[PDB]
Amino acid sequence: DLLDIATRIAISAIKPKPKSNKPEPYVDSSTINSLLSFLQSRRNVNELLLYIMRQAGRDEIDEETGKLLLASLKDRELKDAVNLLGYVKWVYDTLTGLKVNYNNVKGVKTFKELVNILSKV
Amino acid sequence: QDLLDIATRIAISAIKPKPKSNKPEPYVDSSTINSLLSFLQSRRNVNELLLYIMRQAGRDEIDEETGKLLLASLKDRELKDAVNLLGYVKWVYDTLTGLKVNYNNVKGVKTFKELVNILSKV
Amino acid sequence: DDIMLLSPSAIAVPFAVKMFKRSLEYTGFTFKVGIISVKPDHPVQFAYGAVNALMEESKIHTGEKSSIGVLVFSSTLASEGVVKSDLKNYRKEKESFLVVSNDVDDVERLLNLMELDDFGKLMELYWNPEEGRKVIRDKIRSLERFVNYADTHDFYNTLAYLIRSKAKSEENSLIKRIIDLTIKGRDDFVFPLYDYYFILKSIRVGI
Amino acid sequence: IPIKVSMRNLSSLTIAGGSTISSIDIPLNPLGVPPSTIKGTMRTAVHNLLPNGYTSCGEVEPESIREAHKNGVCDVCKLFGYPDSLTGCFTIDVSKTDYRTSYITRVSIDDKTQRAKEGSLFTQQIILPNSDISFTVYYNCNDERLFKLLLYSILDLRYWRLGRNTMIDVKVNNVEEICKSVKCDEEINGILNQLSRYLWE
Amino acid sequence: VIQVFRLNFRLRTGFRVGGGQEVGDNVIRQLRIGVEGVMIPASSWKGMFRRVSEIVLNSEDHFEEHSKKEVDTRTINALLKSDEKFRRIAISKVGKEVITQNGINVDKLDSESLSDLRRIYNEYNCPIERLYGSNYFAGGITISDSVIPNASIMERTHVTIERKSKKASEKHLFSEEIIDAEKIEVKVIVRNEFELWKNSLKLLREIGYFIGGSKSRGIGYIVLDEKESEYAVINNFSETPKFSELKRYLS
Amino acid sequence: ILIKLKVKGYITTQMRRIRNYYFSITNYIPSTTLRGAILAEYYNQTGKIDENFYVSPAYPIKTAPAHYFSPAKERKGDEFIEVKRILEKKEKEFEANKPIEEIMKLEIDGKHPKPKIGSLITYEGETDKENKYREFSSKSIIQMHVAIDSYKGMLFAYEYKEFDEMWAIASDSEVIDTVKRIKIGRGKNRGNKVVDVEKVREVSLDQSKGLLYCLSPCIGSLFGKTFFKAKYIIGDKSIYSGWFTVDSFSGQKPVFETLREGSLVYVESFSNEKSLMPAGLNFMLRISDLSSIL
Amino acid sequence: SCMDLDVITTVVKIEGKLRNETLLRVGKGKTQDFAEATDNPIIKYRDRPLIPGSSLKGAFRSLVESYTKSLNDSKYYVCDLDDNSCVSCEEKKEGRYCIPCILFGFKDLASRVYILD
């Protein structure tokens, strides 16, 4: 469901950022918090899409992650968009806190698969 | 009984003292497990509860091993048994905190009846 | 060897405790004692049979100590068969809350903890039910709640709740003392809870 | 003629039985729901809700029952049996057991204020709602008017309290054998259809 | 005649009906079930309805427990010889020997029996007692519970502010549960087609009363609607009851 | 003929009406009550009733009333012992001039037992010649009921008994073939839980001269009608309150005290009068031991 | 006698719309309790911001207590919330009354003015 979309988006956004001297994901938690705050303040989905596009164009959001976000957040209700963004934020925070390597986590496309991976080890 | 054993294993995992702490505090706080139960109650969804506990583990607010055990236990559970398991966990954790039982006492107790044997002796 | 007494319920159990505290000192014989409490309209012969059955069942196997059994018939008639069935159903040898075979000193400690050993307090409660009912209900409400939850769930769950109640009890409170008296000093998973509840209930219904 | 009736309580149904070992203020029967409770409740409902063309003693004193039976019909009293004349008319037995249990408590709010009265707190043992109860009413006599009266009794049981003013919904799980047995009357068919499904969907 | 009602209430925010709340204080626990989850006990419904009906009637006799005046024994005898059902109630309660078919048998009477008869007279002459019943009265109203399959339970914490200095009083952290809901469905059967009942429902239509605890704190406020709720009047026992919109019955 | 009753439910028994209460008296089920139930079922089915029908009192399965030569090894316990084929090892010398006081010597070993004639005993095990037994205890409950027209006026109470599978011996008739379940108890139309009758293998027991175990509360004679004479009677007195038809007027509630069930009587001659088996009495039989249930 | 809740003479209902003038921040009892928003989020009823009834009741009670103490009248007093020896009104022989206790209730007396969310 929405959780699978959120997990795929978080995995795409957690890929290592090239030309960065320190190991870190391509995006930052500040970007996700800004996304949520902008959606809450503006209460519009098209404005959120514009924000996502500009963040992608600022060379700080992975183009694949941006494409996934735009694909998910079209013909979608505001409440559904809010829920999806919250799920994305929570999954990203979990992955950051657990320091999950992107190499062994990029191969999962289901939330249940991610849960199994985390539970096993 | 079996849920009691699961809950007491979770509780003894959670009673591990938090290192580099000024006070001999448990790794997992009462407010944390209370928040777990309340979130499960309000959000009647096992997957959302799993996401919640995963986020809490990533926040370094609950024990990594206890989070692993919780995720393994509640990986494929329904809601009715999940709320009962969380209630039992709350009960046993509160008992341990009130009784001032240290981890070295319970250590690796597997059966709830053995735990209550220890409590009766102590 | 034959003792029969029909004292009022409001004074019965403390009377038995005071009488049989020094039984070994006086006669040197341990006594098995059964105590019931039926309504006045209850038939007398069947009550006699039931109390005899209870007295026989409440026998210490070692025999070096006296035994006191208390069983209140609030809204149920009493007979020997009913007593036997109830003892075979609820009371057991591994995980039970109805000890029946209760040592006298345990009841004495319970009364001391409840401040009911003194005859002056008992009579003050007895002669004035207006305050007596309130006082005894205040003393018995927590134990009644514990027994209620015991009736709700099984042995393990009840014991877990009892331990939780002991944990969440401020210092110098009565609940912790009662729970400690109930739990500590019990070898098997046999704990006098129904016994203590009925001991309190005898005085409760006595007024 | 067996009547396989299934009843499901619409609220927290409870009755007070008794036990030497009990602590709850409101006890429960050890076996569950006894046939006596159902029979007495049904008789009460019939007397209070009497269908047209019938007579009810509506008496508790057996001497009063005899005095009413001085004329000697009491259709309801015939259906439920004379005190000392007929052996019996019908029987009720309950097979299902092992109901769910939970302890609740109630208070009594003060009138002058809106706070609970100090010391008016009492507990109550209840059976969880939406629990199915099945019992069979074996009518052994040979009469059609009395059988119709019994059917009206079962129907009126629906609009009636059963224990602590707890609402109930009676359902009949047999219309085929009832019609096949005897007297598949249009009125009988209508009332049986009415009793075939719950009042509340 | 039997009047059947299926009331629905569009309560603002949520409600809370607690029970037991364990020990140790701390949070406030709303009563559970174990299987069905949460529910509102029928006794609470009956209490709320009695309060609303008492407000509607505004009877001074009911306010003083119907113990404010001395009822002449001649009036009691007149009612006993005039009302068959009242005579039957009195005989079933105080005893056939005490009260004969015709007469009061003053010689066998005493203080407590006379007090019981006077109380029975007063309560039988009160619409509220005739509807909701009494210690000896039959009753007249049956209310089911409102068990909800939904179990959405959120926690609304609270803190006390020191008046002398506006800060949290580090003495306790009050925590209160709350059951959010939008439509509470309760089935009510009334066996007394009383204009008092209609007036009570009418009062609930516009003003609306509270249900559950902490009603002073915005927790629990129901208002009866005339759209989802439906009723049914039963006078014949040979016809299937028909439900219709509550507006026709109430408006 | 043997019958089986899969009761496994709460039923009533001999009641002792007190004020308005009712109490259980007999831990077993008396033949008269059973016979009344089985005949009431026949009446319901057809209405044509027969008085030539006799049925032994039912007892809990694998149980039996106690006799004198089956005492309890403990003065307060419930463990009963007896010698295999005791009645063959007993009796026998009754033909000879052997003193009865010497015959009833129960001191097989030190601390000789004390018997309790007429108690429900359950077979336990072999244990060489002395067979192990245990007294039977049943489950009882109290069912009290209120009296209303909405408002209470009176009060009543009852005492039910729980039973397992029941066994009894009846008369070879089509009655048992055509009857399957019998309402039994004080309140037949109120309080029954589950009842049924199962037919099983035919039983052929012989009644003739010699020591006989009186299963029913036997009576030697009534109204001068001599049924049998006994050399020595070992047992206890009982009180009988039952039913019997004498064809013409009257014929209910004849009260005549009798011998307690399980009494041991050495009858040496009988008579050919109207047998009292249909009256629920005189169900004696020759047995080797209590293992005759097999 | 201020315990007249048994007899209800009149009931008045005040319905209106509350519009904040400044940046209204909800109480946020969800202290460090995130649900679906960043950091500590304000409380809301199904994603709809909600002013707690308890908060309004507390503010109103504080204002009423301030007014009553400003009255400086012997007949009208305010008792501490933690005190259990306070009473609402005293009918000793003219009496004393507690205005906040009359309005929003106390331990001894329930409230008379209900405030919704």
Which residues are registered as beta bridge partners of D133? D7
- For residue A54, report the phi and psi dihedrals to the nearest 5 degrees: -65, -40
Which residue among F149, F190, F193 places its CB closest to the CB of D44? F149
* Gyration radius from chain C CA atoms: 17
Contact call for residues F52 and F39 (beta carbons, < 8 A): no
Closest CA to C139 of C66, C82, C91, C202: C202
Q: Is D115's CB within 8 Å of G6's CB?
A: no
DSSP line for C91-110:
--SSEES---SEEHHHHHHH
**Least CA distance to B117: which residue of chain C?**
C189
For residues F112 and F134, the answer to whether their CB atoms sit within 8 Å is no
The 3-state DSSP class for residue G84 equals: coil
Distance of CA E180 to the CA centre of its chain: 23
Q: Report chain A's terminal Cα–Cα distance, integer Å.
A: 24
Per the CB < 8 A criterion, the answer to whether A118 and A27 are in contact is: no
The verdict on F137 touching C (C-beta cutoff 8 Å) is yes
User: What are the beta bridge partners of residue G76?
Assistant: G97
Best of B31, B35, B42 to substitute, by most chain E Cβ atoms within 10 angstroms, is B42
Are C136 and C179 a contacting pair, CB within 8 Å?
Answer: no
| Other beta carbons less than 10 A from residue A4's beta carbon | 16
Q: What token pair was written down for D51?
A: 């269908």
**Interatomic CA distance for residues B89 and G37, integer angstroms:** 27
What is residue C68's DSSP assignment? E
Phi-psi region of E42 (alpha: psi -120 to 50; beta: other; left: phi over 0): alpha
Backbone phi and psi for residue F51, each to the nearest 5 degrees, phi listed first:
-95, -5
Residue E87: both structure tokens together: 């005579």
Which residues in chain C are closer than 8 Å to B4, comparing Cβ atoms?
Answer: 156-157, 160
Chains A and E touch (3+ CB pairs under 8 A): no
Give the total residue count for chain D.
Answer: 201
E-strand spans in chain G? 89-90, 96-97
Instruction: Give the closest residue to E74 by CA, choosing from E17, E118, E115, E135.
Output: E118
Pairing of strands F132-135, F120-125: antiparallel
* Tokens found for residue E160: 């006390």
Smallest CA-to-CA distance from C202 within C120, C128, C118, C107 is with C107
> What is the Cα–Cα distance from E97 to E82, expressed in whole angstroms?
20
For residues D33 and D169, the answer to whether their CB atoms sit within 8 Å is no
Read off φ and ψ for residue F154, nearest 5 degrees: -145, -165
Check if the beta carbon of residue B86 is closer than 8 Å to that of residue B36. Answer: yes
String of DSSP letters for G11-25:
----------SS---
CA C194 vs. chain centroid, Å, equals 7
Q: Which of C41, C43, C82 sits opposite F142 (nearest CB)?
A: C82
Q: What is the DSSP string of chain E?
A: -EEEEEEEE--SSEE--B----SS-SEE-B---SSS-B---HHHHHHHHHHHHHHHH--HHHHTTT-SSPPPHHHHHHHHHH-HHHHHHHHHHH-TTTS-SSS--TTT--HHHHHHHHHHHHHHT-HHHHHH--SSS---EEE----BS---EEEEE---B-SSSSSB-BTB--EEEEEE-S-EEEEEEESS--HHHHHHHHHHHHT----SS-GGGT-----B-SSS-EEEEE--TTS----EEHHHHH-
Q: How far apart are CA B121 and CA B117, in angstroms?
A: 6
Question: How buried is residue F46: exposed, middle or buried, by Cβ count under 10 Å (0-12/13-18/19+)?
Answer: exposed
List the structure tokens of F61: 């399965």
* Nearest CA distance, C81 vs chain E (angstrom): 34
- In chain D, which residue's Cα lies nearest the Cα of C72? D20
Rounded Cα–Cα distance for residues E83 and F267 (Å): 72
Is B34 near chain G, with CB under 8 Å?
no
Do the Cβ atoms of D37 and D164 come closer than 8 Å? no
Nearest to C195 by CA among C150, C160, C133, C137: C150
Residues F266, F93 contacting (CB under 8 angstroms): no
Chains that touch F (3 or more CB pairs under 8 A): C, D, E
Residues constituting chain C:
207
Experimental method: cryo-EM
CA distances from D60 to D86, E89, E104, F149, G73 (A): 18, 11, 20, 5, 65
- Rounded to 5 degrees, φ, ψ at D59 are -130, 150
| Contacts A–G by Cβ distance under 8 A | 13
Sheet holding C32-37, edge to edge: C32-37, C67-72, C102-103
Q: Would you call G44 helix, strand, or coil by DSSP?
A: strand
Residue with tokens 């109550």: D124
Q: Taking a contact as any Cβ pair under 8 Å apart, which residues of chain E between 92 and 151 contact chain F?
A: 92-93, 95, 136-139
Burial of A108 (C-beta count, 10 Å sphere; 0-12/13-18/19+): middle
Q: What Cα–Cα distance (Å) separates residue G117 from each residue in E19, F41, G29, G58, G111?
A: 23, 69, 15, 13, 16
Burial call B92-113: b when 16+ CB within 10 Å, e when fewer: bbbbbbbbebebebbeebeebb
Residue D117 C-alpha from the chain's centroid: 34
Inter-chain touch D11–E96, beta carbons under 8 Å:
no
- Asked if C42 contacts C75 with a C-beta cutoff of 8 angstroms, the reply is no
Cβ contacts below 8 Å, chain C against chain F, sum to 42
Residue closest to G31 by CA, chosen among E157, B48, B59: E157
User: Are residues F27 and C81, on separate chains, in Cβ contact within 8 Å?
Assistant: yes
Verify whether the Cβ–Cβ distance B95 to C167 is below 8 Å.
yes
The answer to whether residues F95 and F152 touch, using CB atoms and an 8 Å cutoff, is: no
Give the chain E residue nearest D62 (alpha carbons).
Answer: E96
From the centroid of its chain, how far is CA D172?
Answer: 14
Contacts of F23 (CB under 8 A, 6+ apart): C43, C46, C79, F15, F16, F159
CB proximity under 8 Å: B 40-59 to E: 41-42, 44
Report d(CA F129, CA F86) in Å as an integer: 9
Contact by Cβ (8 Å): E179, E32: no
Q: Which long-range contacts (CB under 8 A, 24 or more apart) does E158-163 make?
A: E158/G29, E158/G54, E159/G29, E160/G81, E161/G58, E161/G62, E163/G62, E163/G65, E163/G80, E163/G81
Nearest to B50 among A97, A98, A115 (CB): A115
DSSP string, D136-197: EEEE-S--HHHHHHHHHHHHHHHTS--STT--EEEEE--SHHHHHHS---HHHHHHHHHHHS
How far apart (Å, rounded) are the C-alpha atoms in residues F182 and F166?
13
Of C120, C114, C121, C158, which Cα lies nearest the Cα of C140? C114
The kind and range of the H/E element at D93 are: strand D90-94
Contacts of E148 (CB under 8 A, 6+ apart): E37, E38, E39, E179, E181, E184
Amino acid making up residue C116: L
Contacts of A5 in chain B (CB under 8 A): none
Compare all CA atoms of chain C with the CA of B2 and give the residue at the minimum distance.
C156
Are the beta carbons of E32 and E140 closer than 8 angstroms? no
- Separation between Cα atoms, residue E110 and residue D137, nearest integer Å: 46
> For G33, which residue in chain B has the nearest alpha carbon?
B35
State both tokens at E195: 């204009």
Spatial distance between the Cα atoms of E85 and B5, rounded to a whole number of angstroms: 62
Residues from chain B contacting residue G33 (CB–CB below 8 Å):
35
At residue C86's C-alpha, the angle toward residues C85 and C92, to 5°, is: 100
Angle between helix C129-152 and C174-183 (nearest 10):
50
Under DSSP, the state recorded for C38 is -
Quote the CA–CA distance of C65 and G71 in Å, as a whole number.
73
Nearest-CA neighbor of E141 among E198, E189, E187?
E189
Chain C interface, best mutation among B116, B118, B122, by max C CB count within 10 A: B116
Only one residue has tokens 């089986």, namely F4
Segment holding D122, helix H or strand E:
strand D122-127
The secondary structure of residue A95, as a DSSP letter, is: H
E39's tokens = 């529910």
**Long-range contacts, stretch G77-85, CB < 8 angstroms, 24+ apart:** G79/G106, G80/E163, G81/E160, G81/E163, G82/E169, G82/E171
Contact call for residues E225 and E218 (beta carbons, < 8 A): no
**What is the length of chain E?**
251
Return the closest-CA partner of residue C146 out of E17, E20, D18: E20
Round to whole Å and give the CA distance between F117 and F70: 8
Could you tell me if F154 lies within 8 Å of chain E, comparing CB atoms? no
Per-residue DSSP letter, B75:
G
For residue E194, give every residue at least 6 positions away whose Cβ sits within 8 Å of its Cβ, in sequence order, or none.
Answer: E127, E130, E131
Chain centre to alpha carbon of residue D156: 9
3-state secondary structure chain F: CEEEECCCEEECCCECCECCECCECCCCCCHHHHHHHHHHHHHHHCCCCCCCCCECCCEECCEEECCCCCCECCCCCCEECCECCHHHHCCCCCCCCCCHHHHCCCCCCCCCCECCCCCEEEEEECCCCECEEEECCCEEEEEEEEECCCCCCEEEEEEEEEECCEEEEECCCHHHHHCCCCCCCCCCCCCCCCCCCEECCCCCCCCCCEEEEECCCCCCEECCEECEEEEEEECCEECCEEECCCCCCCCEEEECCEECCCCEEEEEEECCCCCCCCCCCCCEECCCCHHHHC
Is residue G26 less than 8 Å (CB to CB) from chain E?
A: no
Which residues, including other chains, have CB under 8 Å from residue C190's CB and lie 6 or more apart? C93, C94, C95, C96, C99
Nearest chain E residue (CA) to D115? E213
Q: How far is CA F180 from the centre of its chain?
A: 21
| Residue labelled with tokens 């709830």 | B112
Q: Resolution of this PDB entry, in A?
A: 3.5
Q: Which of G60, G94, G93, G88 is nearest to G74 (CA)?
A: G94
CB neighbour list of residue E72: distance below 8 Å, 6 or more residues apart: none
Residues with Cβ < 8 Å from C196, sequence gap 6 or more? C110, C143, C178, C182
Q: Is C143 within 8 Å of C178 (Cβ atoms)?
A: yes
- Whether the Cβ atoms of residue F208 and residue F286 lie closer than 8 Å to each other: yes
Sign for the pseudo-dihedral over CA of B59, B60, B64, B70: negative
Within an 8 Å CB–CB cutoff, is residue F272 touching chain E?
Answer: no
d(CA D56, CA D37): 19
| CA neighbours closer than 13 Å in the CB half-sphere of residue F132 | 5
Torsion of CA E119, E122, E127, E132, to 10 degrees: 0
CA distance E181 to E41: 16
3+ Cβ–Cβ pairs closer than 8 Å linking F and C: yes
Phi/psi at E96 (5° precision): -65, -40
Q: Is F90 left (phi over 0), alpha (psi -120 to 50) or beta?
A: beta
Residues E219 and G56: beta-carbon distance below 8 Å: no
Q: Which helix (H) or strand (E) holds D91?
A: strand D90-94
Are D157 and D170 in contact by the 8 Å Cβ rule? The answer is yes
